[PDB]
Amino acid sequence: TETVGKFEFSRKDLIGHGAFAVVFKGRHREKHDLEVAVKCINKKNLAKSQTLLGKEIKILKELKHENIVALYDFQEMANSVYLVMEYCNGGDLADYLHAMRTLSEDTIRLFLQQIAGAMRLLHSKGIIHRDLKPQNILLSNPNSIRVKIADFGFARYLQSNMMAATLCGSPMYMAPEVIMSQHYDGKADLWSIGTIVYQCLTGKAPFQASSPQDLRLFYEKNKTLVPTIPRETSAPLRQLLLALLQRNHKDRMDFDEFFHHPFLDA
Ligand SMILES: COc1cc2nc(-c3cc(F)ccc3O)nc(N[C@@H]3CNC[C@H]3C(C)(C)O)c2cc1OC
Ligand SMILES: [Mg+2]
Numbered sequence: 001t002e003t004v005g006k007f008e009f010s011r012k013d014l015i016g017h018g019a020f021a022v023v024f025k026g027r028h029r030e031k032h033d034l035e036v037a038v039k040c041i042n043k044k045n046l047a048k049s050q051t052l053l054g055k056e057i058k059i060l061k062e063l064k065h066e067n068i069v070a071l072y073d074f075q076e077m078a079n080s081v082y083l084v085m086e087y088c089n090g091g092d093l094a095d096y097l098h099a100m101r102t103l104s105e106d107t108i109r110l111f112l113q114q115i116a117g118a119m120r121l122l123h124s125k126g127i128i129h130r131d132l133k134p135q136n137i138l139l140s141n142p143n144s145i146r147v148k149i150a151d152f153g154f155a156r157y158l159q160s161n162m163m164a165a166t167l168c169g170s171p172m173y174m175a176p177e178v179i180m181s182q183h184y185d186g187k188a189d190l191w192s193i194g195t196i197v198y199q200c201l202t203g204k205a206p207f208q209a210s211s212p213q214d215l216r217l218f219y220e221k222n223k224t225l226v227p228t229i230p231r232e233t234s235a236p237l238r239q240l241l242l243a244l245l246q247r248n249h250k251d252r253m254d255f256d257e258f259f260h261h262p263f264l265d266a
């Protein structure tokens, strides 16, 4: 039914929707075996959806990396926006995690090495993602498994001597400085990553609360945070998690330490 450049899809083939996007499966019109996902406006939140998809194009078209979902093409118009992306045939990390419950340290390591590779590119380009969470990490069996960071609608460029202050992201993964409406930088993404890794290890968030507001109050009242790391956790992973899940961004692990962390060694 619908064409976007050299690609096509039908709205019969719904992959899913959230508040700000609807995704369909599609294919290249010449090479029918090249599958794609086609992200489109969610007209129920039309203005915001259109803004986020346009922001996502602006970032994603600058990123070419095996562990960042590839933007094959896009189409922006006054009243419509489409992104054509590589199809990730494994679904997302949230569904994988819900199934497996918890992952081994070896799997965590493989996934985190890949995420770290993506984060190296973002950091070199001066981009912060701002919505890292398992729902935005996709799995692809190209036959060995690749993780792919997705959903760059909240991402922005942040000049290295500046701070961001837009309240955006998902509260369960937000760095304390973000949810407390303070200024933040690229280290806020490292907290989100710490939370993802913790959740993979344990099956829960390190700091649980009834609501975003309760989570905020928790971080406000607690001047140090110590997540509970299971006794059987390896020493490198314990160390990595404690350094990532530091309440205060000035004490939090920085990118150079993260990239070169012993836990990530082969
Ligand atoms: C193979 O199975 C699946 C493939 C999927 N591919 C993409 C996908 C999304 C992209 F942006 C780019 C390429 C892709 O492949 N996204 C999915 N779900 C998205 C991602 N997490 C939230 C969810 C949604 C629809 C609310 O956004 C998939 C879910 C799947 O199974 C449930
Ligand atoms: Mg984003």
Ligand SMILES: [Mg+2]
Binding pocket: 175, 177, 183, 184, 185, 186, 187, 188, 249
């Ligand atoms: Mg910060």
Ligand code: NA
Binding pocket: 062, 125
């Ligand atoms: Na760039």
